Symmetry: D2
């Protein structure tokens, strides 16, 4: 029942199931996982692929010989399991050298080192077959107002992404970039805090068609925002290159709960949106098994990520296929929302007396929207009450 298959495009970061359980007030509760182990267990659970930071796969400071050995180890695990590597990313946040950021660090030499660290992992990602390269600028920001001129930081961020886009085109690489927004933590405020801010920044890049967003469920909910609404605007702009699925209980620290947890109804409306729009990218889970769990609970949490998506997918499909729902959507004039407001043109609208001079404003105002019956129908479908 609700069994994931590799064709479901479910992917996991090595840092997700491999999280040793270390939070700001406690030490690790689980031993480190061999990346080869994680690929094997995730393949057994029905996952389609894995993703990685450079430091997840190759320990920081490894020589060129150990690096090659670590990649050959990893490559063999992908060959033996049939697991893909659809996206890769850079760790520009863990080492103390990135404490003021990577691409927008105040120190110029740290910025230049951040670009070199990203570039050689882009080579590795392409060699592993990744189609998307994600950038989470978790250290780009500030705790105080004077520590960062945001206009200058935005110049340095545009410079870095323009240089990366110049690298991939000059190399012929078939890879696109996905900015992952986050409003805060670990910095007090992070640059490009939401999906909207990231989408606007992309329009100022040299080659905007190379860049999209990788939104995370919990990150937009850390700002109290409606995540399905943000995804819809990302899809509307044609910039949903990638997605991060997890759960979050409102505005607080980044929980990274398994998908389906947190705001359950928002997860239902997101799956309904992703499936109706025909999203064909990876279903990526950027989550953390709670440090209360042993390794059996780690794999149970990862399986719950995939199970919860499949249950919600079934409930959303039954919701849209219901003739009572389809009739209710017409009763709320969802069909009129899709119709153009003034396809007849500006001049016709200006001479249309039925639009103003002879508009019965009270008859229109008295028309109920019937949203509550429609929403209860969605609730019945989500809960399996019909």
């Amino acid at each position: 029942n609700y069994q994931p298959t590799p064709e479901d495009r479910f992917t996991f970061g090595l840092w997700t199931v491999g999280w040793q359980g270390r939070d700001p007030f406690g030490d690790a509760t689980r031993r480190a996982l061999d990346p080869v182990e994680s690929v094997r267990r995730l393949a057994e659970l029905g996952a389609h692929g894995v993703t990685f930071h450079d430091d997840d796969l190759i320990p920081f400071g490894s020589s060129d010989s150990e690096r090659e050995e670590h990649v050959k180890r990893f490559r063999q695990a992908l060959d033996d399991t049939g697991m893909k590597v659809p996206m890769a990313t850079t760790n520009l946040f863990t080492h103390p050298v990135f404490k003021d950021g990577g691409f927008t660090a105040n120190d110029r030499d740290v910025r230049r080192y951040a670009l070199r660290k990203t570039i050689r992992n882009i080579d590795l990602a392409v060699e592993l077959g990744a189609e998307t390269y994600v950038a989470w600028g978790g250290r780009e920001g500030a705790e105080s107002g004077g520590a960062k001129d945001v206009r200058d930081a935005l110049d340095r961020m545009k410079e870095a992404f323009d240089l990366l886009g110049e690298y991939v085109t000059s190399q012929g690489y078939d890879i696109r970039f996905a900015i992952e927004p986050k409003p805060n933590e670990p910095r007090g405020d992070i640059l490009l805090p939401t999906v909207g801010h990231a989408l606007a920044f992309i329009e100022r890049l040299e080659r905007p068609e190379l860049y999209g967003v990788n939104p995370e469920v919990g990150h937009e909910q850390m700002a109290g925002l409606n995540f399905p609404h943000g995804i819809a605007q990302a899809l509307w702009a044609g910039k949903l290159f990638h997605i991060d699925l997890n759960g979050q209980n409102g505005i607080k620290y980044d929980q990274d709960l398994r998908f389906g947890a947190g705001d359950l109804r928002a997860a239902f409306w997101l799956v309904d949106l992703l499936e109706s729009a025909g999203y064909s990218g990876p279903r990526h889970f950027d989550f953390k098994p709670p440090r209360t769990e042993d390794f059996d609970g780690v794999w149970a949490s990862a399986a719950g990520c995939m199970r919860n998506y499949l249950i919600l997918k079934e409930r959303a499909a039954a919701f849209r296929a219901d003739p009572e729902v389809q009739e209710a959507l017409r009763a709320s004039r969802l069909d009129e929302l899709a119709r153009p407001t003034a396809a007849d043109g500006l001049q016709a609208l200006l001479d249309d007396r039925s639009a103003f001079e002879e508009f019965d404003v009270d008859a229109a105002a008295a028309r109920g929207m019937a949203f509550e019956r429609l929403d209860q129908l969605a609730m019945d479908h989500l809960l399996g009450a019909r």
Copy 2:
């Protein structure tokens, strides 16, 4: 001391000082103000101009004769006082007909009526000399997930703004549009919730150069966002057409407190940003005198808006002019943040061994940012402790 002059570009909405004090749980505590009265008292306080919704100046449903009479009344008050009208806007949120929105209402005929209501107030705004026309889509949104397909709503929102831009260019009007974002209230979630979302939406319009943002202090703080950071990104994109100043105490209902209230330090960093960047638009206060006040408290609150800006302007100017601060900014490498990361080019950065192979990552990591001394210097300057 800290006396505003009309050259300070301080402006107020008629709906601000004219707010009768009616909240969702109580009736009005103040009588309605004659718009002529509001223009006279605000001019006496040192304000530079006023702004208005169409329904603030002309009562809804007024005939073409009373409309002209109401405008002639208003025009005479501007002539007798020297008060400008730099921005105007439309009330597409009060009447019950807009309960599901205006530009993105599900009913098509309400959308068409919303455009006609906006267009004829654009004519009046141009006749009154307004340079900016603001759109706050307070009713564009939903309380439930199925009530609104956001992709379709974004098509209807783009259609409306494209038609308005087509009207003003075909008429030769010298006026620009400023979208005012708000994350929620009165709707459960409002479309284009933050400055970033509005900036990204503008890049998909037919003539993006006609559209900017009118951010409000409290609205971005309703999402826990750093308002000075959002303004900097709006300035970075060259889209800060207008600004709304007020105060807000964190994530809750839209308080619309007087400017300087709420987050005082964030107000200091905003004034510092607005003045250093050379912002030359109106300093507009979209605030509400608390309903506990009589009319004497209304004018005291409005005066406090202008006083608080002038105090913060002086403290920010003394902050930047301090040689100890200038030396501290260099100690934190703010000068290096403004320097290009790789002006030598991609190829030079790739062959630069000092950027990676020979980068002393521990020496760079051990370099303190000295942000705390810089921030305490800003705190001393704000508090007048130096």
Copy 3:
């Protein structure tokens, strides 16, 4: 399917279904309801009773003759339908005279008038058979720090409730008081913001056994708090006299959505808690049908309140009755949580070497909590996936 009966103890405020749809940015979208009408339609839907503010039933300023007429009208509707009146309350927030509060208004004469308004509605509530009298101090608070000395306000709040408790005991009335907390709105900060603050204040009253709490789902979620946790502490103290059920989407304005909306999983854990603990009070819905609805949507929303509780009640009962869940609860040591930590006493614990000197801290640390499998089992039960 999921049909409410009067024995389900479902109750509604007259102000809930009777909300005309007036928010801070719009006018009413529905006509006023006759209280007799509301009693009839709610009885047809399966509700058990209604509740009321004094101003909901008797218009403010009504003479002693119209007052009696309004009550006789209402009494006849209760007799014809079999509808109870389990709780009543006072409107100390709508009239402009309460703009600085009622029990803790700065003006003494307004405080004294607030007590007289409450007392004569206590008489009416007893005559109508109410067992609980609710106090929501929505206007007790401040927007600025100097406007209210909170220690003095807490003295005035204790004085008011002590006087009310002195009235009901001297009259022999069989009625108890329930304080309904709310963190903010309409005031910037409201006194006694959460369930905890109200519970602590009750312990300082003259006769604490006369006072309990009436928590609301959305109000505690306006502070980001876990509502099931707060109810458990209220039950733990034996002070859950009454409950307000609705929905809320995180930290924002008081949405008052229908129950089941907002945080669906938190609604499931609340119903599970209320039923397992044997809560026998009224299931009261303090909600607002969205102003987008006509009167048909009003009754659909009210029916959804009752339906959603019954669905969640069934899913929670199936959850606790599942042997796999019962075995999982033991695997997570929920049975050990209920066992006393040191029933052997302090001296025995001090001499117990197995508790410290010989405690294998690493063997205990390596024991997984198995919380994720338990939570996924709860998720399957909520979604009807088992």
Copy 4:
């Protein structure tokens, strides 16, 4: 200027200035501090004393010989500097054994070990002369609803504190307990989330007079609550045994910024409250120097904690001493708030026709509160504009 002296009662935790800068997404940026070093540098800065977790002073797992050596080292540093130890606490949150809590862990044997770990540090705290013992139950809580029965957990929490109170009285120790609330992080929801919840729980203990609260500025602001209001209720109940001062920027992760940062106006109203009420306990700073700082920035941040309190103390004292402010306080009827509402008694209030039958409700409603002029006067005083 604004120089702290030991008589200012300023104290710091060893874990504050000693924080190595390790957050959930990065490694340490500073070496560990010798506790002897921290006592020396803090004494040079003008601090009055230090506080400690048991694991801050004695490394976890130390033998009885190294333990005594570590204490003798520490004792010598206190003797050479004149530094006090006013409060101590237990680390029941760092070791993996506490991953499900200490006093309310599901496993009984972990609960018993948590009590033994606390008890022997109570002995050490008394030997070092601490008057207050703080308990922060950072691990008492849950991430999911079924993982913890809160009623059972509250029984286990009451059992633990009753046993600790039984230990200190049976030993003749002169020490009191202060519960430090926190709404969340590291757990999804923490038991006793706010000051109110902790105050209510104390009233159910066996000897409530032994227990108070140790509120933290940022923790109550993590729930959007007004911290000065919470302190006033703690003072009103006579339970402000201790206080934690820091800064926090709204609802997000626990920032632990230096005091004065975050919400500056709320810091002003807190100092004004603490000084007017005559609070004589330690001024304790539970803060974290940002990991961007080296050790020079650590001591600059700690000095800023003390400086900011002294500046705010001066501005608040000048505020209350201003005759214009005193006259404004009377204009807003703050003197009437302190007057009893019905000192004449219930019977007199019932027969007082001027309180109801003859109360001019419109004349009272028309009286302005004059709160805005009072607040602007406070703003001028805070900013040094008068």
